[PDB]
């Protein structure tokens, strides 16, 4: 199946099905210029009828376009034909962290700070570009062949003024800031090390009081530096939370081995030491 760009020329070849978004259908797409495979969202016009989703797809593109960073999924090109919206994105062959953590359950400390270093790197560029992610989760940390991490899915992204990790300040109807991303970051780290989030992720009104409030159990299994860092990122009030610069300079990062580079065997098997 060859896909021609009606505006510009211009030929692409679609390969294997990668999965679903949602709500989009995803495929491999080789730019024939060029000769290179991309992970691509193929969004038919048939699901984007309401003048409500059309704006949300347009926004994601608008925001993702101008992002250029080694730990941010690279936007390549978008176009559309008769059928379908085409968003061509950086191919990450090892899928995501949600995948690897399903196989592993829990990660070792050197692995955790290997992934977090890359996340904070990507999120920092994001936050300097005045853009907020608003949907940080393991499923949105894409991993390439070289075991490198890219932050992806700017579907919920917006610039400064339903997600996995609701912050207390968002639940106090004060909207989403940069510190609300740092909230998600602590949840991410907690899950990497323990394999269950610190709070319920149902987004139901019953877990709201639980996340005001920031009441959660800190397991004994966690080492002190890991414990002290998580507690900081998950502080009740947003102002008490550490800066992104503060996070990567914490004792958790300065003490301990740490790669790069990780072997991909770490996707399924637990690494030596
Ligand atoms: C474009 C959306 C998002 C994204 O933004 N980027 C950048 C991305 C970059 N790279 C990938 N890579 C792969 C993702 C999944 C698979 C895979 O194993 N899929 C299987 C196919 C056979 N099957 C029936 C079971 C599922 C392989 C990948 O590369 C080898 N996926 C990406 N996605 C995903 C696309 C579907 C949701 C998320």
Overall, the morphology is: globular
Helix content: 25-40%
CATH topology of the largest domain: Transferase(Phosphotransferase), domain 1
Indicate the CATH architecture of the largest domain: Orthogonal Bundle
Distinct bound molecules: ligand R78
Percent strand: 15-25%
CATH class of the largest domain: Mainly Alpha
Which structural category fits the helices and strands? Answer: alpha+beta
Tell me the domain tally: 2
Subcellular location: Cytoplasm, Cytoskeleton, Microtubule organizing center, Centrosome, Centriole; Cell projection, Dendrite
Binding site for ATP: 18-26, 41
Organism: Homo sapiens (Human)
Domain Protein kinase: 12-253
Please give a quick description of this structure.
With 273 residues, the chain is an alpha+beta fold. It contains 8 helices and 10 strands. Helix 3 packs antiparallel against helix 5.
């Amino acid at each position: 199946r060859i896909i021609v760009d009606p505006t510009t020329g211009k030929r692409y070849s679609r390969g294997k099905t990668l999965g679903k978004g949602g709500f989009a259908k995803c495929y491999e797409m080789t730019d024939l210029t060029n000769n290179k495979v991309y992970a691509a969202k193929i969004i038919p016009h048939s699901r984007v009828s309401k003048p409500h989703q059309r704006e949300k797809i347009d926004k994601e593109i608008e925001l993702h376009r101008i992002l250029h960073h080694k730990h941010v999924v690279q936007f390549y090109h978008y176009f559309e034909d008769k059928e379908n919206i085409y968003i061509l994105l950086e191919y990450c062959s090892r899928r995501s962290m949600a995948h690897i953590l399903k196989a592993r359950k829990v990660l070792t400390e050197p692995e955790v700070r290997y992934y977090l270093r890359q996340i904070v790197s990507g999120l920092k560029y994001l936050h300097e570009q005045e853009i907020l992610h608003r949907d940080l989760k393991l499923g949105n940390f894409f991993i390439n062949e070289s075991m490198e991490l890219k932050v992806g899915d700017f579907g919920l992204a917006a610039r400064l003024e339903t997600p996995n990790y609701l912050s207390p300040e968002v639940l106090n109807k004060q909207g989403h800031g940069a510190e609300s991303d740092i909230w998600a970051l602590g949840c991410v780290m907690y899950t990497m090390l323990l394999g269950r989030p610190p709070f319920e992720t149902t987004n139901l009104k019953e877990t709201y009081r639980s996340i005001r409030e920031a009441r959660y159990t800190m397991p004994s299994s966690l080492l002190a530096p890991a414990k002290h860092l998580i507690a900081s990122m998950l502080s009740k009030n947003p102002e008490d939370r550490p800066s992104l610069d503060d996070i990567i300079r914490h004792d958790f990062f300065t003490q301990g081995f740490t790669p790069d580079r990780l072997s991909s065997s770490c996707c399924h098997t637990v690494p030596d030491f």
